[PDB]
Amino acid sequence: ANTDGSNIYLKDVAKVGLGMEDYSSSTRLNGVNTTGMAVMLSNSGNAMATAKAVKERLAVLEKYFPQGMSWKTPYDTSKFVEISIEKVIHTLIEAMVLVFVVMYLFLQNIRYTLIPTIVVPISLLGGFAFISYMGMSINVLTMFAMILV
Amino acid sequence: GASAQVMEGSVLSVIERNMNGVEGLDYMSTSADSSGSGSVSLTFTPDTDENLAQVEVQNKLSEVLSTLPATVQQYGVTVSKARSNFLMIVMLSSDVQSTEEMNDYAQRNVVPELQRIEGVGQVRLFGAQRAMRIWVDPKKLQNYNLSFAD
Amino acid sequence: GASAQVMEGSVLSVIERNMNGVEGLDYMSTSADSSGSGSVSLTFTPDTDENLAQVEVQNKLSEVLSTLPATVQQYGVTVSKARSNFLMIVMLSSDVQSTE
Amino acid sequence: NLAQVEVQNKLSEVLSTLPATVQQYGVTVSKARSNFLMIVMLSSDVQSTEEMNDYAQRNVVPELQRIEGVGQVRLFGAQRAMRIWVDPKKLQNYNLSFADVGSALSAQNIQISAGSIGSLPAVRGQTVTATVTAQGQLGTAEEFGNVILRANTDGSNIYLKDVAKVGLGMEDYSSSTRLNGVNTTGMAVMLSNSGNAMATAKAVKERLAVLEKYFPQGMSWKTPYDTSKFVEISIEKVIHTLIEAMVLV
Amino acid sequence: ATAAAXLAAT
Amino acid sequence: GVFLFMRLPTSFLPTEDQGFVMVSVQLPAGATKERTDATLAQVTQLAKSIPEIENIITVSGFSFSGSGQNMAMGFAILKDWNERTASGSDAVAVAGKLTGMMMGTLKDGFGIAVVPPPILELGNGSGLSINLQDRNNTGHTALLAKRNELIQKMRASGLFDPSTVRAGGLEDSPQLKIDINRAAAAAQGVSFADIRTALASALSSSYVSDFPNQGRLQRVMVQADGDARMQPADILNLTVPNSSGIAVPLSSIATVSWQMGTEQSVRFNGYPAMELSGSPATGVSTGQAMEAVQKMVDELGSGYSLEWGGQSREEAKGGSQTIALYALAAVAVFLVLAALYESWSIPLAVLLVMPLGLAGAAAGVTGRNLFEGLLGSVPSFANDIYFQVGFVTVMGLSA
Amino acid sequence: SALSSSYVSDFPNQGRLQRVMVQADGDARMQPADILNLTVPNSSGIAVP
């Protein structure tokens, strides 16, 4: 501030604007600049329901997006668990069919092919209950163990 | 604005010499580079609770904060566990507005929405948020006999 | 030196929305007064140990405290786990000295 | 652990009200026993006790205190420091004061962070980037002795070697140790709550044997006071008595 | 740091 | 059967096809970010010639090796397995294709495409990770020379597949060290606080205060204009204020010259360390390689130590636990059988069947490896975890 | 200042920052007659016993 007035402002020696903090990194998806977000699953949380919920919420929010914007989910780790579960069920059914065929071929009656079918799934359910008691979870290794057993 | 040598010798060594005696510590490391950022990683032997380890590490760090440079204190020092359960990745593409505008929109409109979903443990946004940037021209300062501290 | 809305959206909102996902959480609440004061109430479901909950809450709060305002950081955020209903009330009486 | 968490929470609310010096030095919290588990000496013949104290602080103490079961290690000494001894009778012939010395020391031993040439939010056409470094800091006794306290117009500056004596020394001349009459370097190891004695002593001795390889040329180690030998001998004698009793029966 | 990658993909 | 089993390659888990491949880019030291962006754009345009890829995500200025303007990385996401169920549509085939195409196109810098392991914590092929420390603070040049001497002693006269013994850091690059003249700054009214003020204000950023931006607080930062921090002749021309406000060219105070400095610094367990990597050549146990490395390190002076890092850590502690556990299991099985049959003789008759299953499994694995390799492929099966689980299962059934 | 030390700054001593401390000479803080001659200054600078 001068004695006679005519002060010096901050715009006489500088240029003020709005920007970022760092300017270091720069992301792009297929050539168009983007912004990425990572979602982490909480301990003791289903990994499929959470992905479905996230997708539905994003679809709902998409309505208010500014013109030009869009969203995508290039990666998702909740498909491997679903694939493993499907494989486990497929193998269980195939094993039941094979056991039925072998038992009928050798024993030659339909009253024999029901006992194994009744008794196998109960054992599998008991194993499920025990693993739940110990505080374990459902993942690919557990499914492979079930397939082996 | 700190080289690797300055950063190490002035921050990382000071922080590391005090993290001895934490119950269950296996080994520790230190890394610094010219980008102006560094970290200290402590690995613990199995059978040790991670929450207790984090709290004790924070408490240990609280006793040396007064000996670090002023800038480091202004910015702050974080403490987090390296564990993570990655679930998925979200991308917003515009092609019409700059990346900082998208970052602001995501941080102010989208990130809080996904944090309230059932099963979500944490969401991380990659990128720096906005700030008021001032670009000084030294020629003008020399013409008026001023300085950056002014 | 803050209103009931600046503190709600610059201090309490961050802590609240960042405290989701703590194991055993039931519901939350916040309150902000015009006198630059506020609180966040965090109610857990029974069958959870209070000590583990407090440790987790402290970890979550500490790993987010590096963004809050400078004066709040200089003052500090207090954590308390105590009841709100009274048990007794002890009164002190006298006729030779004032209440101060 | 929970008790320590509560204690830390209660302490963090009062650090801002303690004197400046107390905050500068810091407040420490510990949970360990108050009786020494053992004492390890570092006698040598070509280094003084200050050198061996510095070496023990730098290389030995950190190794011993991340062993399983060790609660605290106490060094009867102190690490090195740059000691300045001012003569008040010379601050008068020049009209100086202690505050001048302190300010001069604090305004000439500061660290500089320059930056980088060709920084990130740069103009188009840039092809190189270089880091910039300046030392601007003192590390030897002569450099400290050549600090300036008063410029003056005549050009005859007043240094720090003119009104003081500067050299390396201990930061705290409080405690000392001797073994059979000769000076040595010792550090007491104290156990921790819920820690074993025999296992801790065995680990300490094994780690010391490992470290012995990198010692300088002339120093050795020994542990003349150890409280696990009695436990070992007691157990051995009890087992021998057990065997004798079985044979007699 | 840890720019776009999670644990780990983008 | 036992001989066939004892000659099987070892590992932890087989590399999977997760649906994405990883890419890394490096440029010559001291490069800007515009060149990195141009190389990344070239890579992105090159990634479109592979129909097996769907989305390419590129991140500039950051890499797992380090952080700098000359480092970048990207992730390529492939179509679902059903759409790419062919011969050369695997993940490893795509990685090889991409690396080969990068080799002949990228004119500035080099890129490498790899397929990450299933679990980062447990990954085969990590090799030997070593960390030399100096216990008496000799310096950086001395430790680098010792590391080079160790690599030479380990590579030529060694057994580590000399093609893999290499350092694991970042080579130095030129810098702009400044030597200030305190004597010269004292010959005039040039203090030492203004020097630091000018040096740290000219070309470095500053964090001043905060301001409320439409609801939430944000920082306020002050930096010099971009036109004043681009050339080396923008520093020495910083005249410093004198006692009477005069300016000193700063050329009479400081001398500016190029040198070579370290762009990264590392520390392990409180001592300066430099990382190194290696791998035993062939037909050599990791134990002998580790012993040779330890003896070689001992050959160096007293003050340079070695310390394993990563997956080498769990191998340093002897793996003499599986043998004990299996012996205990066999003893328990024998005791149970002896109780069941009421004899000390029949249980051994039952236990004599383990070698049959062991030999069957080993022969099957070896034959499948031979058949696969007989058509150009690489041996994919080894003595990993799944082998052990399957062997235990077959043992149980036969028993 | 007449009888106690002061911690001022830090200096690099072979890979570590170590304290810098200032204290009076040994013989200037030995007898009780070194406190009876402090002679603190005044506003105009003239010392007052």
Residue numbers in the entry:
A (entry chain B): 251 to 399
B (entry chain B): 51 to 200
C (entry chain C): 51 to 150
D (entry chain A): 101 to 349
E (entry chain D): 2 to 11
F (entry chain B): 549 to 947
G (entry chain A): 749 to 797
Question: Mind quoting what the paper says about this structure?
Answer:
In Neisseria gonorrhoeae, the best-characterized and most clinically important multidrug efflux system is the multiple transferrable resistance (MtrCDE) tripartite efflux pump, a member of the widely distributed resistance-nodulation-cell division (RND) superfamily in Gram-negative bacteria. This multidrug efflux pump couples with the MtrC periplasmic membrane fusion protein and the MtrE outer membrane channel to actively extrude antimicrobials and mediate drug resistance. Based on the cryo-EM structures of MtrDCR103-CASP, MtrDCR103-Col, and MtrDCR103-LL, we observed that MtrDCR103 employs different binding modes to anchor linear and cyclic peptides.
To study MtrDCR103-Col interactions, we incubated 2 μM the MtrDCR103-nanodisc sample with 20 μM Col for 2 h to form the MtrDCR103-Col complex. We obtained a cryo-EM map of this complex at a 3.08-Å resolution. In the binding protomer of MtrDCR103, the cryo-EM map depicts an additional large density corresponding to the bound Col peptide. This bound Col molecule is found deep inside the distal drug binding site of the pump. The Col binding site overlaps that of CASP; however, it appears that MtrDCR103 utilizes a slightly different subset of residues to attach this peptide. Again, the nature of this protein-peptide interaction is mostly hydrophobic. Within 4.5 Å of this bound peptide, there are 26 residues, H46, S87, T128, S130, A132, S134, F136, I139, M141, Q172, R174, F176, S275, T277, A288, M290, P324, Y325, F568, I605, V607, F610, F612, S615, F623, and I625, that participate in facilitating Col binding. One notable difference is that some of the polar residues, such as S87, T128, S130, S134, Q172, and S615, do not interact with CASP. Presumably, these residues are more specific for Col recognition.
